[PDB]
Amino acid sequence: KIRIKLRGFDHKTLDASAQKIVEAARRSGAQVSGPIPLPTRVRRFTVIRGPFKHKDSREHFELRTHNRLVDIINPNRKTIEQLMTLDLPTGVEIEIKT
Amino acid sequence: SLKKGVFVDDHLLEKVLELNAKGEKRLIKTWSRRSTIVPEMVGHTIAVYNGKQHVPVYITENMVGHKLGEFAPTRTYR
Amino acid sequence: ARKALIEKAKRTPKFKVRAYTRCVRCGRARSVYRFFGLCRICLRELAHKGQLPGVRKASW
Amino acid sequence: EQYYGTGRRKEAVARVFLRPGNGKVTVNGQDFNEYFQGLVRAVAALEPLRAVDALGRFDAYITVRGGGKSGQIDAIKLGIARALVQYNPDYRAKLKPLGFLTRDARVVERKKYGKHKARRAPQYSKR
Amino acid sequence: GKGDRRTRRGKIWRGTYGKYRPRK
Amino acid sequence: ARRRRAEVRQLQPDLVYGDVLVTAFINKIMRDGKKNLAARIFYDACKIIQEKTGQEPLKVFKQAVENVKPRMEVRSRRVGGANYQVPMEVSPRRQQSLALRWLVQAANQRPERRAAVRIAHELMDAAEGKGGAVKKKEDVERMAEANRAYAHYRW
Amino acid sequence: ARIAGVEIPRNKRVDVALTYIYGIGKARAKEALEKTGINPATRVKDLTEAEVVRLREYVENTWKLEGELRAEVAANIKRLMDIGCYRGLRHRRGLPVRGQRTRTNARTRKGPRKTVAGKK
RNA sequence: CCGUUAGUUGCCAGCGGUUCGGCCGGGCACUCUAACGGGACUGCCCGCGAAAGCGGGAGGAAGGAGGGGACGACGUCUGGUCAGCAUGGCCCUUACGGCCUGGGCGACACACGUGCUACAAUGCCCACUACAAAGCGAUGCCACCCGGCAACGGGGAGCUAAUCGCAAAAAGGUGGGCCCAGUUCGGAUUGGGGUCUGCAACCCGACCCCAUGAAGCCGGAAUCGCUAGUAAUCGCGGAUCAGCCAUGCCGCG
Secondary structure (H helix, E strand, O other), X not given: OEEEEEEEOOOXXXXXXXXXXXXHHHOOOOOEEEEEEEEEEEEEEEEEXXXXXXXXXXXXXXXXXXXXXXXXXXXXXXXXXXOOOOOOOOOEOOEEEO | OOOOOOOOOHHHHXXXXXXXXXXXXXXXXXXXXXXXXXXXXXXXXXXXEOOOOEEEEEOOHXXXXXXXXXXXXXXXXX | OOOHHHHXXXXXXXXXXXXXXXXXXXXXXOOXXXXXXXXXXXXXXXXXXXOOOOEEEOOO | OOEEEEEEEOXXXXXXXXXXXXXXXXXXXXXXXXXXXOOOOHHHOOHHHHHHOXXXXXXXXXEEEXXXXXXXXXXXXXXXXXXXXXXXXXXXXXXXXXXXXXXXXXXXXXXXOOOOEOOEOOOOOOO | OXXXXXXXXXHHXXXXXXXXXXXX | OOOOOOOOOOOOOOOOOOOHHHHHHHXXXXXOOOXXXXXXXXXXXXXXXXXXXXXOHHHHHHHXXXXXXXXXXEEOXXXXXXXXXXXXXXXXXXXXXXXXXXXXHHHOOOOOOOHHHHHHHHHHHHHOOOOHHHHHHHHHHXXXXXXXXXXOOOO | OOOOOOOOOOOOEHHHHHHOOOOOOHHHHHHHHHHOXXXXXXXXXXXXXXXXXXXXXXXXXXOOOOOOOHHXXXXXXXXXXXXXXXXXXXXXXXXXXXXXOOOOOOOOOOOOOOOOOOOO
8 A cells, every 4th residue: 555645836747747656556556546636735925016115005926735645555566667767747746655 | 021040241240249359449331231230249330331321320239130221221301 | 234234144143033034136134035035026026937936826 | 215405605514414204403413403502593594394395394414514603504504405306306496486596605705905804995094 | 801911802812821711 | 876776685584573674673783793692682672572562573563663764854955055954755765764773773772771671662662652763753754844945946 | 897908898799899999809809708718799788797807807917908008009119219210210200111102192191181382 | 506537534424343532444425625627608588679788587506797806008197216126327435334232213292194992781701612714833833741820831742734733713602790880891000920032121022910900981173984795793824023012914704
């Protein structure tokens, strides 16, 4: 039972990047428990638009950490093939656990 | 307001304790108005800076526990 | 002064109380968002360029 | 044996489960009148029944979670209604007239900058 | 109410806890 | 209201007598959106109408209101010079608005310490037709008559 | 009935009534009523001479009060004048003492509003 | 609003074991979480119209811009900002640069703006009583123990946090108290004892507990906001940040 966390600012290249990680584990391992979407940690910034004294009117900036999760029940190396380096994630991260 | 020391300045004490072997000087001028007036080292007169000058403050028993700044007021006509 | 100052804010000083922030570009004291070492202006600036990643136009 | 409709109203969601026969109503492992204890309006949540005639003749087991009480009262009011249309496509033409069937979109409008409060604006002094 | 340190309400408003509103 | 006529906002029937007029009156009792506390009051007050008279509350209620509706009132008006209190017929929707508003105001003018009582005794004093609400209502009606001389300006 | 100093609380509950003493608040009176075992709800109107002395005794003794308290305050302040600390000349001047603003407010410590002229 | 994909957050929904806490096997139904789609078009009916469209009716979560944002034409105000930054000119270059310690920006006879807390019984106090809705936390949140009336101090488990913590939601509901009083309203001011952060709290920090309890009984002439989940009212979080003068602001419900 290999279980993996994936963070990302980019909601597209996760459901993308870490869901090829479901082909290369059903095609090369056995049973998968599909992609699970963890709720998001949304850091927000509120910024006064002008250099000087314009306290009403500012603009809203968010920085949104998306969180996806993957479970597979197959600690063999018929899997750990693609699933070590066979890349398409460029602004992503990995948590590796069992 | 603390209870683990009386956060009084080294540079001042050093100068009082070392005056405490026959020492009766007025010429004593500090800048640490932040330092607590400490149990019994009284008799003397300390010139406390108010930001513009030091002030001849005589120090008595009834007035321990208080800081030095309390006796050297910093602003004018009040 | 703002130089002898941009400089002084870099020396780890006697007592950490004296440790302040400073917009790392727009070399500046106030409204320094800690997650970016960035002054609210020199900040709205880079954000607009996309030179701070994931950072975006919020709207709800 | 079992019947379901989901009600929502403003952060609050209702799990409604209708069962045939009776009259009693659980909400969150608690009697109705124990959950909505002397809150004048609660008697409203079951008004969908009163309108069909199943005034009593149904049991109800209920989960209810989300923000706050008076919403939940309405949340249920939808569940109950939705649940019993899925025990009768013929339960349309009487429930829709009083429309216990419309979700009701009205949420907290959002706090805006420069205002104090979404619409309430700061205090002008002119002179 | 909200102005009185020594009320429940006082404490809430003020953020604090103490004798007049404990932490259970 | 520059564009439209605005729909008479439609109210949710009384969950206890089944009357829109009642909710209306409950809302006028309400302060800072404490609708719960408000209805307690109206009902506790219907309690105090049995406990004191033989007849049905909904009936005292309907009636008290009826007596407090003004039929004419003065509306102010621009003319070449200063202003004119111009008497004119008071529209049904407003009659209602004013009645309820006045009942609640008059109620909280009374001396008794607990709200449901004040509401009740005022409701009672009204159907008998002698509350301070029916007072500040004959004041209007009378004042529209005082000014009967200017009733040739009504728009 | 005269408990402390020169004090006759009356006809209201004793917790409330004890209050009417200078140096007794809602707290010190909650206390006395337990350390002497008097139901605090009891009306002064109705309570044992027994109780009234158990009270007299506890209160007049446990803590400084109502007049000779007042005297200690008067004399704590005239001593804050000492050689003359800050808070001293400040009491001297009749201005705030727990370091608050004076530009606006400070009305409690200053006699209503001595208005002047100026401007153009 | 509905669907598809997806099962450490959802449950007897269904059944079994439950030390009766979804806790345990077990399942994703449902709730949710988050990605993707569908859905509304004056498309349908009646009436008016030359047409656009208007008024009404159907069905539908939603109907005629369904609700809230982001988004600000050509230009105007020789508007704002040289103290964010960039910059032409101009000016000081043992000083108009620099360093430090202390004071100041916190002064107070006055005057205005914006707010807070009130003036109370539709109220105040004390008790008991999950209705959760955004966000933050490994030089942190700190459960839970013990000492202390408490601030807080010991200890001390868990969480790189849908898992652990901040966290009590408050208004509410139930019970009891106060009985119209400058009060069990209101908490200013002052005396005192302490806690914490910090080299350091006099000028100039917040917090706890004892005392003290001020003006205020709803405000002249004026004058501000808001058209619906709005106003009013009740709490909750965050940014800066050692601590904090936040009642401010940006956000949640």
